[PDB]
Amino acid sequence: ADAAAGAQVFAANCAACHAGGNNAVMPTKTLKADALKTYLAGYKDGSKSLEEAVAYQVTNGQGAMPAFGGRLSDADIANVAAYIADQAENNKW
C-alpha cells in the first residue's frame, strides 16, 4: 500500500502512543524492525507479512492498543501499515 499516504494516517491516529516509532505504553514493543519481528503477532511467526500483520493489528486492536476498524477507512488502514513497514524495514524512525 502507499507508505507516503500512510504517514499522514500515522500523524493523525498513532503518534500519541508511538511517537518516534517507540511505544509509550509498553516500551519494549516498539515499531522498529527488530522489535516487530520479535513481538508482532503473525509477522513474528512467519505466517503474515509485516504489512499484513500491521494492518490486522490496526484493524482489530491488541492488548491495550485500540482497534481502528470502523474508525478508519480501508485505504487508511492499508496505507498506515505500509508506512510502518517502510519506516521499519528501511530504518527511518
Give yes or no for residue 57 binding ligand HEC (CB under 6 A): yes
Cell 494492518, residue located: 55
Residue 45 sits at φ, ψ, to 5 deg, of -100, -5
Smallest gap from Cβ 2 to ligand HEC, in A, equals: 14
Q: Which of residues 3-32 bind ligand HEC (CB under 6 A)?
A: 10, 13-14, 17-18, 23, 25-26, 29-31
Return the beta strands (E) in the chain as ranges: none
Q: Which three cell numbers stand for residue 90?
A: 528501511
Give yes or no for residue 82 binding ligand HEC (CB under 6 A): no
Residue 48 sits at φ, ψ, to 5 deg, of -130, 150
Residue ranges that bind ligand HEC, judged by CB under 6 A: 10, 13-14, 17-18, 23, 25-26, 29-31, 35-36, 39-40, 54, 57-58, 62-66, 68, 80, 84
